[PDB]
Amino acid sequence: STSDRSELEDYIVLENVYRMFGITFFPLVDPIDLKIKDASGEIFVDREMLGIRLEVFSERTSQFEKPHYVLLKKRIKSNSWFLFKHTIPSFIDVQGIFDDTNGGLVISHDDAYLFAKRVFLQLVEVQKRRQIFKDLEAKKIIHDLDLDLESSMVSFFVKDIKVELFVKQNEIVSCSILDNNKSKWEIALLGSLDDLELKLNHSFA
Amino acid sequence: LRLEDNYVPTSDTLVVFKQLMKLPVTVLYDLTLSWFAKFGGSIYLLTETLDLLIEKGVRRNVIVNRILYVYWGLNVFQLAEIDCHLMISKPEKFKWLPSKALRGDGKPYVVKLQPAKFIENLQTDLAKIYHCHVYMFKHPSLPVLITRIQLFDSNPLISRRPYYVAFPLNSPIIFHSVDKDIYARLVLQSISRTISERETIIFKPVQKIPVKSIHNIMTLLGPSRFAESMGPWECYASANFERSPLHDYKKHQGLTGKKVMVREFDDSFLNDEEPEIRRLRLEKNMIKFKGSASRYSSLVPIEKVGFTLKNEINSRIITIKLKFNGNDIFGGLHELCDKNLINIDKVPGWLAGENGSFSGTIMNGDFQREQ
Amino acid sequence: YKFEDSTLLKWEILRISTNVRLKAKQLLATRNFQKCLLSLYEFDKIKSKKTGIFQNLINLLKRKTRCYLMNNSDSLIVERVTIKLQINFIITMPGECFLPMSKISIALWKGGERFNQIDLDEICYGLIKEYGVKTGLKEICNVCLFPDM
Amino acid sequence: DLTSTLLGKDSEDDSIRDDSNILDIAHFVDLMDPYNGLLKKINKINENLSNEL
Amino acid sequence: RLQILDDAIQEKTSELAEFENMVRSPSAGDNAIPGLLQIIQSYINLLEEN
Amino acid sequence: PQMDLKVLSEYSNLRKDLILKCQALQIGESKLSDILSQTNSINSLTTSIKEASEDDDISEYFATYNGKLVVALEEMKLLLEEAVKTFGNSPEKREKIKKILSELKK
Amino acid sequence: MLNDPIKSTADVRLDKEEVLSLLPSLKEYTKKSKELKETMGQMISDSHEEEIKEVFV
């Protein structure tokens, strides 16, 4: 098994270059419903299962993070998937998004791919929201800070002022300055998230 | 009439002695320093007195007489700090009960609260009804917020049982301590009114059976990767089976291959040596009841579980009602399977341990919880 | 690769078929290749869906009135009697969300001059919101016909 | 109101919001492309015609 | 907020005004356009002959 | 909502003013996003031609654009004349026409 | 990404003159866009892009 070993190595590196995309559909089987048809001794699967492998790639550490998995199981009497056992943390709402896609019923594979892409966009948004504040810390423009699990509410320090931020999807909505120039500085930093990185050098120069 | 920290209640001294005797010496030193920095009574001159006392290796009794007889109850804030540090120290004494936070159509609402402005709002909402005092800190290990809500009554002020409400940081599930009196409903309803501030939130309870510790309820129903898998799917909550695509291919499960055992599918269990096969059988039981590979207890100990299996044979709804009990249910079930009493080929997923601490029915092969 | 302590150090581009190269020129400087692969795949999917929608509309409107495409494929203009209808479909690659978001706007002409844009934007927004994409455009060309109702 | 004002009984003079400039910019940048363009379209044809015989 | 939005719009329209002078080319290319059209007609005749 | 009637008129005037404020805010935000996309496309074009030329002669590129196009179509007309007076076949000429169609089509 | 309409004002119409005077730089952007489209159309009509696009296929 040498030529087959090289063929399997090419298969594994092809699995790797497909897995670098981020949204892959790995096959799966639940080991309880492996029923035997008793016609020839062979084994057929009763209820099909299809596993989604979400995988967000970071940029600061330049490595792949821990991949989150979603598992879908076909219902027994409807030919539509229902969300069996997902691993996404609960601040990203998963069941409501699965009810929202295609009116609740998911039949084809690309219909599941749309749901996987929506959850993927949410995860990459959370990851970039964490990364931009972590690199603002690593550039030493800000002092010690605290992050939430989703990086939607953070509180950092500047040279004099304690600043609280409540940020929505990749753009800042509510700010807080605490320690008539304070209101101007408050509304000035509002906006995008890289605009915060630009405007912090506008007031700390 | 919202009571501030400088007010002192009227409680028995010996029960505070019994509570403060359940703490080590360094947390007592930190408590004395913080209380003397905030309140004082009877600067740095009295600090070296305790610095020399802890250097000599004194017992806890003389230092607890020191703290109870330089302040002589202490105040409401000191009692809150004592009880909350006791909660941090021994977590096995309490009993939590989870509850979701719904709004509008039914979509869940993340709380995203801030510890500063929430406390005065909760206190000014509660003070229009009873005498109250709140206290909120952050757990040092787990990323949650524990809020201790204490209430009083007038026959000076007779204290009540302290009510705890544990907020996780980014989850729509809020734990509260198990009670059913009218004060518990008042505190939970007041929190449900004051946490919102933009659009109204309601608290539908997701469970009826209490669970023991805060690490257990955090791993079960907080923001975590183990929040839904919890059973034979525990491998996907830790990802110990795959590596990144930037890893080596020589150390890959596709290339190395895992040692497996041929399953049996005929009824060859009711008719009843080779230690490699014995080790593989124990590995099979470890796979089915847990993740990949003490030694019987699961990740989370579950107290009480009641199932219901409503199958359907020849258009007849045939119900059975399983009920369980004990300290850790699925660990004891894995132990009973380990003694070759339960055929692991026919153990379904809901019995195996998945959707843990959820006592619900089954209608045609898919679990659903109970209200 | 780093191939142990798994890290990407260097990645670059060898050669591109010169069809999206100017559009990819802005996106391929972000140094995040996952966004690059997913944005290229989503661009291919969105462009195939757009040319399918326009082929459907031309195959359903080539009988009664005239039709012709425009700049590359980004907008479609039909005419009648005269009265002209212009529908726009612009695919914007991201730069300085990260998926290539599309834009749909319509514009009318009564022969004399262009109509107001606010009411047409509100009407096409509500009609796409209520019917859809493959059905909303058929309804909007049926209401810009207006021979009977 | 639209079906009334079409047949029985609009105009545009000021633009607070429009779409008639970004596609003109797009047509300009595909005309002036040094990568695919239209001038580079001819530059591949005569290279192919030189390789045709 | 409207003032800082107007400042950003003024900055972007000054960038657009700086770009707009790089594209103006006053030339007599209408005769060159007529020569291009005549050569296109000759190429169309040679293609129709092919 | 909407409503000493002079201060009531002043309140309704201020309400209409703030409604116009948030209306103009939304309009300006959407228009600023459109302008930012337009100038991003313009910056992509200018950086592409600066990478292609590598001589900082963008104005000379635009001014001599019609000259490059006219010498290109002159070479194209000479190549068409050479293909008309040199090949004179039915398979090679049709293959050259199909190659020209596949090149100038898309 | 649709052309999103303006938020509901409860019977307060979109007075375009008042909000246009509120953002006076938009007229400058309008005349700059008119000059840019004029110059680009002059560049397009000289290049015979539609002519060579229609004579070929």
PDB file of C-alpha atoms in Angstrom, chain G residues 13-31:
ATOM      1  CA  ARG G  13     -43.707  64.865   3.902  1.00  0.00           C
ATOM      2  CA  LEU G  14     -40.173  64.827   2.522  1.00  0.00           C
ATOM      3  CA  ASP G  15     -39.509  68.539   1.957  1.00  0.00           C
ATOM      4  CA  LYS G  16     -36.554  68.169  -0.402  1.00  0.00           C
ATOM      5  CA  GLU G  17     -35.723  71.888  -0.436  1.00  0.00           C
ATOM      6  CA  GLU G  18     -35.326  72.135   3.347  1.00  0.00           C
ATOM      7  CA  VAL G  19     -33.139  69.041   3.697  1.00  0.00           C
ATOM      8  CA  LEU G  20     -31.218  70.102   0.596  1.00  0.00           C
ATOM      9  CA  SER G  21     -30.473  73.450   2.244  1.00  0.00           C
ATOM     10  CA  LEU G  22     -29.594  71.490   5.387  1.00  0.00           C
ATOM     11  CA  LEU G  23     -26.860  69.651   3.425  1.00  0.00           C
ATOM     12  CA  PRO G  24     -25.533  72.358   1.069  1.00  0.00           C
ATOM     13  CA  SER G  25     -22.545  70.288  -0.103  1.00  0.00           C
ATOM     14  CA  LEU G  26     -24.901  67.869  -1.879  1.00  0.00           C
ATOM     15  CA  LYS G  27     -25.454  70.460  -4.618  1.00  0.00           C
ATOM     16  CA  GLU G  28     -21.670  70.629  -5.027  1.00  0.00           C
ATOM     17  CA  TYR G  29     -21.589  66.838  -5.319  1.00  0.00           C
ATOM     18  CA  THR G  30     -24.433  67.024  -7.853  1.00  0.00           C
ATOM     19  CA  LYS G  31     -22.645  69.516 -10.099  1.00  0.00           C
TER      20      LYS G  31
END
